[PDB]
Amino acid sequence: GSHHVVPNEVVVQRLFQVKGRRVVRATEVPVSWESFKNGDCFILDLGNNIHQWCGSNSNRYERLKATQVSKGIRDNERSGRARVHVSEEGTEPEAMLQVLGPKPALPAGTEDT
Ligand SMILES: [Ca+2]
Ligand SMILES: [Ca+2]
Ligand SMILES: [Cl-]
Ligand SMILES: [Cl-]
Secondary structure, three states: OOOOOOOOOOOOOEEEEEEOOOOOEEEEEOOOHHHOOOOOEEEEEOOOEEEEEEOOOOOHHHHHHHHHHHHHHHHHHOOOOOEEEEEEOOOOOHHHHHHHOOOOOOOOOOOOO
16 A cells, blocks of 8 residues: 555563462563562563573572573474573663663562462
8 A cells, every 4th residue: 555554563572470489380471570570580582582580589499490481482482493581680681671661670579479
């Protein structure tokens, strides 16, 4: 047509919360800094790139599991064809700030149960 004014679709994005005391679960949550808590880990899946983030008060078990979830998306869902970027509070890649916007101060979240 003569005039193309409708925005194109952008790549699907997902965010997982990686949380637990010793039984650690990955739960899909809304893609927003409001999902983030400094007590847990988060996996921001941007398709060809996956951002693995752990908070300063995340526990060992969560950090281990975050590695498994990112690798698992890459390997089981992307056929190995994706880049994992590991970051932490305050070291987030620009690509993650582009998606989530400027980073606010983050709360601790709920104790793991
Ligand atoms: Ca936690
Ligand atoms: Ca705790
Ligand atoms: Cl056209
Ligand atoms: Cl990177």
